[PDB]
Design a protein around this motif. Structure first.
Motif, PDB file in Angstrom:
ATOM      1  N   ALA A 193       0.972  -1.130  -0.059  1.00 30.31           N
ATOM      2  CA  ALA A 193       0.042  -0.291   0.069  1.00 30.31           C
ATOM      3  C   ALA A 193       0.840   1.238   0.064  1.00 30.31           C
ATOM      4  O   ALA A 193       2.187   1.121   0.370  1.00 30.31           O
ATOM      5  CB  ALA A 193      -0.874  -0.278   1.488  1.00 30.31           C
ATOM      6  N   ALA A 194       0.379   2.163  -0.625  1.00 33.52           N
ATOM      7  CA  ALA A 194       1.101   3.744  -0.831  1.00 33.52           C
ATOM      8  C   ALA A 194       0.026   4.646  -0.232  1.00 33.52           C
ATOM      9  O   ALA A 194      -1.051   4.802  -0.726  1.00 33.52           O
ATOM     10  CB  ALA A 194       1.412   3.937  -1.975  1.00 33.52           C
ATOM     11  N   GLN A 195       0.646   5.599   0.971  1.00 34.11           N
ATOM     12  CA  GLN A 195      -0.110   6.627   1.336  1.00 34.11           C
ATOM     13  C   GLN A 195       0.504   7.896   0.649  1.00 34.11           C
ATOM     14  O   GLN A 195       1.767   8.104   1.165  1.00 34.11           O
ATOM     15  CB  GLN A 195      -0.043   6.896   2.699  1.00 34.11           C
ATOM     16  CG  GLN A 195      -0.616   7.999   3.138  1.00 34.11           C
ATOM     17  CD  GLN A 195      -0.550   8.276   4.616  1.00 34.11           C
ATOM     18  OE1 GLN A 195       0.123   7.293   5.435  1.00 34.11           O
ATOM     19  NE2 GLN A 195      -0.841   9.507   5.200  1.00 34.11           N
ATOM     20  N   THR A 196       0.094   8.558  -0.171  1.00 33.35           N
ATOM     21  CA  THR A 196       0.788   9.830  -0.941  1.00 33.35           C
ATOM     22  C   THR A 196       0.762  11.245   0.098  1.00 33.35           C
ATOM     23  O   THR A 196      -0.222  10.852   0.927  1.00 33.35           O
ATOM     24  CB  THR A 196       0.191  10.390  -2.181  1.00 33.35           C
ATOM     25  OG1 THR A 196      -1.130  10.345  -2.083  1.00 33.35           O
ATOM     26  CG2 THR A 196       0.343   9.106  -3.143  1.00 33.35           C
ATOM     27  N   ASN A 197       1.413  11.863  -0.158  1.00 34.65           N
ATOM     28  CA  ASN A 197       1.673  13.237   0.950  1.00 34.65           C
ATOM     29  C   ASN A 197       1.580  12.628   2.188  1.00 34.65           C
ATOM     30  O   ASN A 197       0.976  13.278   3.068  1.00 34.65           O
ATOM     31  CB  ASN A 197       0.545  14.394   0.455  1.00 34.65           C
ATOM     32  CG  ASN A 197       1.112  14.598  -1.042  1.00 34.65           C
ATOM     33  OD1 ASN A 197       0.246  14.123  -2.090  1.00 34.65           O
ATOM     34  ND2 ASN A 197       1.999  15.165  -1.205  1.00 34.65           N
ATOM     35  N   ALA A 198       2.298  11.710   2.757  1.00 37.22           N
ATOM     36  CA  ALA A 198       2.444  11.451   4.283  1.00 37.22           C
ATOM     37  C   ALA A 198       3.386  12.220   5.065  1.00 37.22           C
ATOM     38  O   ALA A 198       4.231  12.937   4.223  1.00 37.22           O
ATOM     39  CB  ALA A 198       2.904   9.970   4.135  1.00 37.22           C
ATOM     40  N   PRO A 199       3.040  12.238   6.135  1.00 36.18           N
ATOM     41  CA  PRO A 199       3.854  12.903   6.985  1.00 36.18           C
ATOM     42  C   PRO A 199       5.345  12.485   6.952  1.00 36.18           C
ATOM     43  O   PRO A 199       5.750  11.315   6.688  1.00 36.18           O
ATOM     44  CB  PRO A 199       3.536  12.495   8.450  1.00 36.18           C
ATOM     45  CG  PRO A 199       2.172  12.478   8.244  1.00 36.18           C
ATOM     46  CD  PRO A 199       1.982  11.681   6.908  1.00 36.18           C
ATOM     47  N   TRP A 200       6.459  13.292   6.842  1.00 34.91           N
ATOM     48  CA  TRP A 200       8.136  12.807   6.800  1.00 34.91           C
ATOM     49  C   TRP A 200       8.359  11.765   7.166  1.00 34.91           C
ATOM     50  O   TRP A 200       9.009  10.825   6.758  1.00 34.91           O
ATOM     51  CB  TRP A 200       8.762  13.947   6.567  1.00 34.91           C
ATOM     52  CG  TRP A 200       9.260  14.288   8.222  1.00 34.91           C
ATOM     53  CD1 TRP A 200       8.931  15.449   8.879  1.00 34.91           C
ATOM     54  CD2 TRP A 200      10.538  13.634   8.703  1.00 34.91           C
ATOM     55  NE1 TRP A 200       9.355  14.964  10.221  1.00 34.91           N
ATOM     56  CE2 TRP A 200      10.502  14.495  10.040  1.00 34.91           C
ATOM     57  CE3 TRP A 200      11.340  12.596   8.429  1.00 34.91           C
ATOM     58  CZ2 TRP A 200      11.425  13.961  10.994  1.00 34.91           C
ATOM     59  CZ3 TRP A 200      12.369  12.083   9.402  1.00 34.91           C
ATOM     60  CH2 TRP A 200      12.363  12.471  10.637  1.00 34.91           C
ATOM     61  N   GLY A 201       8.056  11.489   8.522  1.00 32.19           N
ATOM     62  CA  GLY A 201       8.556  10.242   9.469  1.00 32.19           C
ATOM     63  C   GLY A 201       7.942   9.007   9.072  1.00 32.19           C
ATOM     64  O   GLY A 201       8.629   7.952   8.878  1.00 32.19           O
TER      65      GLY A 201
END
Length: 279
Positions: free
Chosen positions: A1-9
């Protein structure tokens, strides 16, 4: 799975390089695991928790989080947008008052509570406890953390924010738990992060966006923010069957990104938590 525009951490923990913004992870997402957040409480009604958070214990007049700190940490463990393990079950234990303070006797009681209370919960994939708290050295506090770990809970604790050797802080200095330092988005040791031989791992801790009280969000910094990245990672890896509560800290160190952080003092591990997920 990919979460775009995620928090940098989140992006950092699934990457071999800094400077990316998509979080990649196995869709099992910590389902069937449980993470106790031992802190100021959790605003379980926050939409970000999706009904997966609940308060199980308080030592004060309310179980509500009147501070925000515990809600932020819980969000990094398991919220839908800000969390590492987006399908874990979150259990709040309020050992800290709404000013963020708590007596060691209360904190010890909370740890022993979790060691027993897990037997009242359904966590077939395993149990984790996240402790974004600490103070000066106490053998009794360390012993309580050691008991919680021994009971079958993966215990992750904050190293502390004193830019000092964590050997002088508890539960950070307990050898048998997972002591977590903080890094920033450029792979530098966070300016405030404690260090020393007792650290096991670093996680993202500077400028961490997560949930806050009042149904809100904000970005704050601390080893308190790095700790739930590691706790959520442990829950995620336990759900995958790659490790166990007793071995997860060592497994995370085994599989970490190595030698990539700057300003790590000689004698402190240069290890950054990494999920090793291959999409």
């Amino acid at each position: 799975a990919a979460q775009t525009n995620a928090p940098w951490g989140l992006a950092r923990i699934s990457s071999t390089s800094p400077g990316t913004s998509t979080y990649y992870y196995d869709e099992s997402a910590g389902q069937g695991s449980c993470v106790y957040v031992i802190d100021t409480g959790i605003e379980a009604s926050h939409p970000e928790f999706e009904g997966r958070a609940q308060m199980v214990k308080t030592y004060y007049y309310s179980s509500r989080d009147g501070n925000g700190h515990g809600t932020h940490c819980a969000g990094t463990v398991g919220s839908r947008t800000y969390g590492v393990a987006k399908k874990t079950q979150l259990f709040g234990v309020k050992v800290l008052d709404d000013n963020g303070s708590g007596q060691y006797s209360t904190i010890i009681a909370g740890m022993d509570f979790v060691a027993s209370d897990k037997n009242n919960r359904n966590c077939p994939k395993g149990v984790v406890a996240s402790l974004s708290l600490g103070g000066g050295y106490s053998s009794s506090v360390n012993s309580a953390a050691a008991r919680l770990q021994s009971s079958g809970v993966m215990v992750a604790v904050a190293a502390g924010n004193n830019n000092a050797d964590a050997r002088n802080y508890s539960p950070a200095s307990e050898p048998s738990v997972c002591t977590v330092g903080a890094s920033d988005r450029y792979d530098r040791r966070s300016s405030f992060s404690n260090y020393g031989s007792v650290l096991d791992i670093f996680g993202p801790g500077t400028d961490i966006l997560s949930t806050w009280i009042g149904g809100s969000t904000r970005s704050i910094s601390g080893t308190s923010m790095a700790t739930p990245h590691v706790a959520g990672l442990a829950a995620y890896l336990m759900t995958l069957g790659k490790t166990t509560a007793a071995s997860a800290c060592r497994y995370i160190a085994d599989t970490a990104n190595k030698g990539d952080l700057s300003n790590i003092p000689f004698g402190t591990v240069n290890l950054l938590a990494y999920n090793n997920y291959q999409a």
